[PDB]
Amino acid sequence: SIMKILLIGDVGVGKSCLLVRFVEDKFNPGIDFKIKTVDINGKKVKLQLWDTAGQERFRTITTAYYRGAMGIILVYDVTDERTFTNIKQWFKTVNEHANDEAQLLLVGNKSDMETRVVTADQGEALAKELGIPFIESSAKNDDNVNEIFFTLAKLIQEKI
Ligand SMILES: Nc1nc2c(ncn2[C@@H]2O[C@H](COP(=O)(O)OP(=O)(O)O)[C@@H](O)[C@H]2O)c(=O)[nH]1
Ligand SMILES: [Mg+2]
Ligand SMILES: [Zn+2]
């Protein structure tokens, strides 16, 4: 089966690096997606994982972008208060444009940085306000990245 999963949020928060860590298991930094197959309940699920450049940032406001998407991950940077502030607007825009059975997930990235300004309780609180699950991650330190996609994939398959 195919699960189309999108990463959404401000430029610079680590969307691409989260995607590279999940697929490649490494931190480093014209085809729009990567395919990674994962076992859920003993059955192969192929995730179709969408990441677009800030360059291409303009699509996220269109319903075309979310065509067939079943998971959407909203990402902010724990080091950047503004990217966290901006999450309510991302939520709203996603709900305006995506399938209503789409499962969403909040991710606070860069948990490795001692310059953190957004607490885990803050992220937890926002997540309840939006009615969604919440995970803190570090693409750099390899912390909680696989959990992001497995958590979301399991929620999507329970929908199905
Ligand atoms: N310390 C730290 N830096 C990160 C992490 N993830 C990404 N970065 C850096 O933040 C910048 C933005 O990452 P990127 O994946 O391009 O963000 P995008 O605009 O959301 O796709 C790059 O310089 C990354 O090296 C992380 O988990 N920890
Ligand atoms: Mg990117
Ligand atoms: Zn790893």
Please name each of the domains of the chain with its CATH number. 1-160 (3.40.50.300)
CB 81 within 8 A of CB 10: no
Which of 97, 71, 86, 80 has the alpha carbon at shortest distance from 126?
86
CA of 21 to the centre of ligand 3 (A): 7
The ligand minimizing its distance to the Cα of 145 is 3
Which of 3, 84, 7, 90 has the alpha carbon at shortest distance from 44?
3
Residue nearest ligand 1's atom 22 by CA: 29
Which of 9, 73, 26, 27 has the alpha carbon at shortest distance from 47?
73
What is the enclosing helix (H) or strand (E) of 70? strand 69-77
CB 38 within 8 A of CB 153: yes
Residue nearest ligand 1's atom 9 by CA: 14
Ligand 1 atom with the smallest distance to the CA of 113 is 1
Distance CA 59, CA 38 (A): 27
Q: Resolution for this model in angstroms, one decimal place?
A: 1.9
CB 10 within 8 A of CB 107: no
CB 101 within 8 A of CB 33: no
One-letter amino acid for residue 46 of the chain: K
The ligand minimizing its distance to the Cα of 140 is 1
CA of 76 to the centre of ligand 3 (A): 21
> Please, which experimental method was used?
X-ray
Which of 89, 91, 117, 85 has the alpha carbon at shortest distance from 106?
91
